[PDB]
Design a protein around this nucleic acid. Sequence first.
DNA 1: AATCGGTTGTGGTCAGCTGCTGCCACCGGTTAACCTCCATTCTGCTGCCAGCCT
Length: 159
Amino acid sequence: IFKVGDTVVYPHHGAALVEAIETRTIKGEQKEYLVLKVAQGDLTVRVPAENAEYVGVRDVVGQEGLDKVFQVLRAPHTEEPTNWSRRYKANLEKLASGDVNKVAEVVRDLWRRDQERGLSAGEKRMLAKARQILVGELALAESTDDAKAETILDEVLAA
DNA sequence: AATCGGTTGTGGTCAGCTGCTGCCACCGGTTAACCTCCATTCTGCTGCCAGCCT
């Protein structure tokens, strides 16, 4: 499926350019690896081509995905558990899934709650992580000028 | 003429509570997928085991 030069999305790290395809040997068989150059912390990720779907690597979403995530990002009736730990584990396991809709849900919930009160060290760190990978995936989805994409996200969040 | 003590017109003044009105430290209680063991030398005492005695 994957080709050299494709821009795929890794689950917990956001965008990833597939820059080469290695052919390393483990247990005497040439399981080909693909190397991904993510840029969040400048790490090179190597995965087999077989377990790409098992680890859940995923192509970027289309314009139906864009209107779907904007539709879910502008939606009310988002009642949350009042317990701080329950809420934290809930949106952490939403963030770790790798779905654009779930990441947009986490950034809209924490954005409205930060606009309300301003939460915490851990939740501001989580909102920064989630919003930066959502901005990176959006800029990958439309080739649309990083930090101007941030202004786009701020505008569609503030509405 | 002064001279040792009062009276005080009047203008600041200066901190001493007094509310008072936030507001900010400080301390207690709560959170419910699941996962169960860290150098040498001298002196004295205390415990070890064989070895004669009834």
